[PDB]
Write the structure tokens for this entry.
Amino acid sequence: AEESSFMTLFPKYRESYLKTIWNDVTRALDKHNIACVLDLVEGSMTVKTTRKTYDPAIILKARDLIKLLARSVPFPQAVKILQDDMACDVIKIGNFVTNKERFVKRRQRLVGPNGNTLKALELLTKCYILVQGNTVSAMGPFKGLKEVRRVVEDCMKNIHPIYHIKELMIKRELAKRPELANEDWSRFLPMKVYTPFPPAQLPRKVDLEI
Amino acid sequence: QNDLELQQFLRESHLLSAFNGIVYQDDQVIGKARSRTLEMRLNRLSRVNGHQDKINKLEKVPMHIRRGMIDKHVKRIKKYEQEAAEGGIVLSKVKKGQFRKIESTYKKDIERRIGGSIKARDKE
Amino acid sequence: QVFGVARIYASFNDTFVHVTDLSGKETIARVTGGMKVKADRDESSPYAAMLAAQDVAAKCKEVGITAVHVKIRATGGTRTKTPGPGGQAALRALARSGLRIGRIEDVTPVPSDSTRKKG
Amino acid sequence: GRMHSAGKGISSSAIPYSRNAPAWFKLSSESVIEQIVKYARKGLTPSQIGVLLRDAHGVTQARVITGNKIMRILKSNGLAPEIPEDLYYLIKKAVSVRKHLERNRKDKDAKFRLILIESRIHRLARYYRTVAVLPPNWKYE
RNA sequence: UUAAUAGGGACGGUCGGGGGCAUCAGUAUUCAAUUGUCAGAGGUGAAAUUCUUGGAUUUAUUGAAGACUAACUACUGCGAAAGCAUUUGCCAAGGACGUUUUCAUUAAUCAAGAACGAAACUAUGCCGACUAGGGAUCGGGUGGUGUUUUUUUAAUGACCCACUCGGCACCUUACGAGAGGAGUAUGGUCGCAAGGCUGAAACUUAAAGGAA
Ligand SMILES: [Mg+2]
Ligand SMILES: [Mg+2]
Ligand SMILES: [Mg+2]
Ligand SMILES: [Mg+2]
Ligand SMILES: [Mg+2]
Ligand SMILES: [Mg+2]
Ligand SMILES: [Mg+2]
Ligand SMILES: [Mg+2]
Ligand SMILES: [Mg+2]
Ligand SMILES: [Mg+2]
């Protein structure tokens, strides 16, 4: 039984934080008999299974754990990925639009004023969401991850997320009512040819006098 | 925009997360969150008509302590922004004078003592 | 040890457990979450995935396969690149069935360039 | 400071303060003159003539060594261009940009640059007309 | 007459995800062809709709079409702006830098005119003719130094430090005449509006309902 191993490079700036928590990461993985190695010279994180590993799938979650830590997710949040229900998703957003100003402006719309819009989306979906560059990193239960994707993608297509926040609250209230479970909730939801040669220039007054 | 419940939840998201589905309905909310929620709502309605000096009064703290709280709080904000700025994380825009509202601001209730901004410089 | 190959396709809405030869060209057994549950809401649940893996593991031992190489995947393409909940459950169930797990890899279709309109 | 551009570069030559020949220079003024005419006969422009003399013969400046500019030395011996050098190159660039345009009719960028070069020619062509270096009837193409 | 730390042109090694025409790649999507197996597969919060024992979905091999240029991607580069990210070749063009090369004021701002050219939804920064700076970064140049590098085949860089010109920005600085909101009341005007069970009125009138 050869060992399945996964390596994830991390930027140099996370070296200080990762070093302090590594004893905690080792303890967290050691509960599942997964060995880990932190390489400060190459700046890499390695997780590898051992002979005592009894659960085959944990190595995947160990791999996701090092990925989240490298992308600046805090360890107390990142360590939740080891739970079966938790999952991580990475959403690309750079490919939606071509105008830089429109791109930044719509991205800011996700964060919202004071970060209110992001926090509202995090609370309702029970998901940890981080907005980075040309991507949005989300972590939480699978149903929450699905909801985050639709908001993030629709936000880049000119739909304000506050609409999605409002629909989520209504859907949560509706889900608690048994009578309307069968009924559709759509009613309750808010609703000449180019020329290659230029024209000549108008001569200056002096040129007329010349 | 005029939906009070949605806007109220959005502005009050930070308090609810700090002092915690999520109990955002006025009947369900209990504990410190309900005390902080009521104060935030009452202040907002007051700012429109009440004179700025009298509506908001920073709690009295001695000299040496308050500079200590501000210096540490600014240090926490600088670390929070620098770690995000060096990374890719996008942070909500803040006016130049005002301090950014980090998670610690809502949890430690620092705002009532240090205040939103150093009023002397905003005057200068 | 005779080695098989287990294709696990874990979508958000369903989980496929497909076992085949090393070539992958000939199907040994294919079981999906929909076949082991009674409701369309629970096809993606880990419980459905566990049942599918057990039936496949039984079918593998009959034909002769004792070990399998796992190449899990997600819907990929322009959709999410993370496997669904069934994917992990199917892998754990196979080990509990006794089939030795040879090698685990992700074969999610990752487009070099997705077909999405800029405008 | 650039015209037709946003550049503010200041790269340039710094003529030395003293206005005599260097002490080490030990070549007759006449021999420089015959070097100048030989190159101009061969087909080199005054600018290119200056570069060769400075690089390989120690002629720091033609005016300094000989007392007269390259332009005046050549004209004295019957060699002077039909049109000023700077106008000559600007026309040559305009022709090349034009020549590219017929083959490539979708190059909107080249159409834009042709405005800047052609408009530069007019300003320069205007100036020489005032000084009478260029005959008044001279029109560009 | 000078040869402006005015301007124009020349020459040298360069730099660029600048432009045009070809050319190459890539995995993905759709479709098609074969092909293993068999009852569901996509989709929603549930459905509906759609595909499907003439084999759908899924597995393997192969082919075609259109679009696109992931990860590298940066508070970085280029372009007058809108914009520009696969390899290679061709065509012209452009910026800065270096110059003891050249013309000799040929310039600056410019109404007119000419060239190019579903969406918004929380933002914001005193301004200027204006001083001295700091860290980081891109392109060019000079010097120092010692590690990568290497040898009479041709080419000949990477890193560190100091200096300097020009950029994208960030953080500080000295200086300056830079000449209605929220409400309340209404013997007016114009509108909107109350009631009695329905049937049922010229009829104290049927069935069937409402209320209880
Ligand atoms: Mg120039
Ligand atoms: Mg000069
Ligand atoms: Mg050049
Ligand atoms: Mg080029
Ligand atoms: Mg193609
Ligand atoms: Mg690429
Ligand atoms: Mg292209
Ligand atoms: Mg670059
Ligand atoms: Mg530029
Ligand atoms: Mg500079």
Observations:
- Residues 1-119 of chain C form a domain with the Nucleotidyltransferase; domain 5 fold (CATH 3.30.420.80).
- Chains C and D do not touch (no CB pair under 8 Å).
